Coordinates of C-alpha atoms and ligand atoms in Angstrom, one line a residue:
Chain Z
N1 CA 22.9 133.5 111.5
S2 CA 22.6 135.9 114.4
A3 CA 23.9 135.6 118.0
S4 CA 20.2 135.2 119.1
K5 CA 19.6 132.2 116.6
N6 CA 23.0 130.6 117.6
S7 CA 22.3 131.1 121.4
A8 CA 18.9 129.4 120.8
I9 CA 20.5 126.4 118.9
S10 CA 23.4 126.0 121.3
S11 CA 21.4 126.5 124.5
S12 CA 18.8 123.9 123.3
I13 CA 21.7 121.4 122.7
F14 CA 23.2 122.1 126.1
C15 CA 20.0 122.3 128.1
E16 CA 17.2 120.5 126.2
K17 CA 19.2 117.6 124.5
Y18 CA 22.2 117.0 126.9
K19 CA 20.4 118.4 130.0
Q20 CA 23.8 119.4 131.4
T21 CA 22.4 121.9 134.0
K22 CA 20.1 119.3 135.6
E23 CA 22.8 116.7 135.5
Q24 CA 25.3 119.1 137.2
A25 CA 22.8 120.1 139.9
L26 CA 22.0 116.5 140.7
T27 CA 25.8 115.7 141.0
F28 CA 26.2 118.6 143.4
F29 CA 23.3 117.5 145.7
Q30 CA 24.4 113.8 145.6
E31 CA 27.9 115.0 146.8
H32 CA 26.3 117.3 149.5
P33 CA 23.5 115.4 151.2
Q34 CA 23.4 117.8 154.2
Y35 CA 21.2 120.1 152.0
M36 CA 18.5 117.3 151.9
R37 CA 18.8 116.8 155.7
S38 CA 18.3 120.5 156.7
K39 CA 15.7 122.8 155.2
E40 CA 17.4 125.7 156.9
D41 CA 20.8 124.8 155.3
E42 CA 19.1 124.5 151.8
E43 CA 17.5 128.0 152.3
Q44 CA 21.0 129.4 153.2
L45 CA 22.5 127.7 150.1
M46 CA 19.8 129.1 147.8
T47 CA 20.3 132.6 149.2
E48 CA 24.1 132.4 148.6
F49 CA 23.5 130.8 145.2
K50 CA 21.2 133.7 144.2
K51 CA 23.9 136.1 145.3
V52 CA 26.6 134.3 143.3
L53 CA 24.5 134.4 140.2
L54 CA 24.2 138.3 140.5
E55 CA 28.1 138.7 140.3
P56 CA 29.6 139.5 136.9
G57 CA 32.7 137.5 138.0
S58 CA 30.4 134.4 138.1
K59 CA 28.6 135.1 134.8
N60 CA 30.3 132.4 132.7
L61 CA 30.3 129.7 135.4
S62 CA 28.3 126.5 135.4
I63 CA 25.5 125.6 137.8
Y64 CA 27.9 123.0 139.4
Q65 CA 30.6 125.7 139.9
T66 CA 28.1 128.3 141.3
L67 CA 26.4 125.8 143.7
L68 CA 29.9 124.8 144.8
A69 CA 30.9 128.5 145.2
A70 CA 27.6 129.1 147.3
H71 CA 28.5 126.1 149.5
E72 CA 32.1 127.3 150.0
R73 CA 30.9 130.8 150.9
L74 CA 28.6 129.2 153.6
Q75 CA 31.5 127.2 154.9
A76 CA 33.9 130.3 155.0
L77 CA 31.5 132.3 157.3
Chain L
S1 CA 15.4 114.6 147.8
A2 CA 18.5 115.4 145.7
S3 CA 16.1 115.5 142.7
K4 CA 13.9 118.2 144.3
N5 CA 16.8 120.5 145.3
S6 CA 18.3 119.9 141.8
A7 CA 15.1 120.9 140.1
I8 CA 14.7 124.1 142.1
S9 CA 18.4 125.1 141.6
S10 CA 18.2 124.4 137.8
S11 CA 15.0 126.4 137.6
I12 CA 16.8 129.4 139.3
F13 CA 19.8 129.1 137.0
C14 CA 17.9 128.5 133.8
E15 CA 14.6 130.5 134.0
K16 CA 15.1 133.1 136.7
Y17 CA 18.7 134.2 135.8
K18 CA 18.8 132.9 132.1
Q19 CA 22.5 132.1 132.8
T20 CA 22.9 129.6 129.9
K21 CA 21.1 131.8 127.3
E22 CA 23.2 134.8 128.4
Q23 CA 26.5 132.8 128.3
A24 CA 25.7 131.6 124.7
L25 CA 24.9 135.2 123.6
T26 CA 28.1 136.4 125.2
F27 CA 30.2 133.7 123.4
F28 CA 28.7 134.6 120.0
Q29 CA 29.0 138.4 120.5
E30 CA 32.8 137.7 121.4
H31 CA 33.3 135.3 118.3
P32 CA 31.7 137.1 115.4
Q33 CA 33.2 134.6 112.9
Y34 CA 30.3 132.3 113.8
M35 CA 27.6 134.9 112.8
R36 CA 29.6 135.9 109.6
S37 CA 30.1 132.3 108.4
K38 CA 27.4 129.6 108.5
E39 CA 30.0 127.0 107.7
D40 CA 32.1 128.0 110.7
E41 CA 28.9 127.9 112.9
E42 CA 28.1 124.3 111.6
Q43 CA 31.7 123.1 112.4
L44 CA 31.4 124.7 115.9
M45 CA 28.1 122.9 116.7
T46 CA 29.7 119.6 115.5
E47 CA 32.7 120.1 117.8
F48 CA 30.5 121.4 120.7
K49 CA 28.4 118.2 120.6
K50 CA 31.7 116.2 120.8
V51 CA 32.9 118.3 123.8
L52 CA 29.6 117.8 125.7
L53 CA 30.1 113.9 125.4
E54 CA 33.4 114.1 127.2
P55 CA 33.3 113.2 131.0
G56 CA 36.1 115.9 131.5
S57 CA 33.5 118.5 130.4
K58 CA 30.6 117.3 132.5
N59 CA 30.7 120.2 135.1
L60 CA 31.5 123.0 132.5
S61 CA 29.2 125.8 131.5
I62 CA 27.9 126.4 128.0
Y63 CA 30.4 129.3 127.8
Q64 CA 33.3 127.1 128.8
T65 CA 32.3 124.3 126.4
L66 CA 31.7 126.7 123.4
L67 CA 35.2 128.1 124.1
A68 CA 36.6 124.6 124.2
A69 CA 34.9 123.7 120.9
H70 CA 36.2 126.9 119.3
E71 CA 39.8 126.2 120.5
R72 CA 39.5 122.7 119.1
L73 CA 38.6 124.0 115.6
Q74 CA 41.6 126.4 115.8
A75 CA 43.9 123.5 116.9
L76 CA 43.1 121.2 113.9
Ligands
CL1 CL1 15.4 120.8 130.6
CL2 CL1 14.7 123.9 130.2
CL3 CL1 19.4 121.0 131.8
CL4 CL1 13.9 130.8 158.1
CL5 CL1 20.3 125.9 131.8
CL6 CL1 16.8 123.5 132.9
CL7 CL1 18.9 127.5 128.5
CL8 CL1 40.8 132.6 119.8
CL9 CL1 43.3 131.5 122.9
NA10 NA1 23.5 122.3 159.3

C-alpha cells in the first residue's frame, strides 16, 4: 500500500480511464484556435508551457491551467 | 488541428515531465493515512472516481482532485 502503488492506481484512473489530461488539452486548443492557425504561435506556446512546467509553483496544476498560464504569459509580453 | 496540438501538449505533460505521476506521489507522501490504511485508500479511490465525474472538476489536476476527494471523506 505504498505511495508508488497508489500513484500508479490513481494516475491510471485519471490518465488511462478518464483521460482527463487529453480532454483538458483538447478543451484549451478548441478555446484558442490561433494556435492551429500559426505554427510560430504554437512554437512560442510550447516554449512557455515547457517553462511553466519547470516551476515548482506550477507543480500541482493541471494541463489546462498550465497551457492557460503559458498563453497568458505570451499575452503579457 | 486541435487534436494534434492536444496530443503533443499531453505527451509533454504526461511523459516528458511526468506531472500527473509526480502529483499523485506528492499527494500520497502528504497524506500518509492512505498508505497506513488500505480501507482509507479504497474509500479515497471511490470518492476520487466520483469527483472526476463532476463537470466542476473537469479542468482540475490529479493533485487537486485527490485533495477534493480527501476533503469529501473528512466532511462526511
Ligand atoms: Cl492516455
Ligand atoms: Cl498515457
Ligand atoms: Cl489523459
Ligand atoms: Cl522559428
Ligand atoms: Cl497525464
Ligand atoms: Cl496522456
Ligand atoms: Cl500519468
Ligand atoms: Cl486535511
Ligand atoms: Cl483542510
Ligand atoms: Na499570431
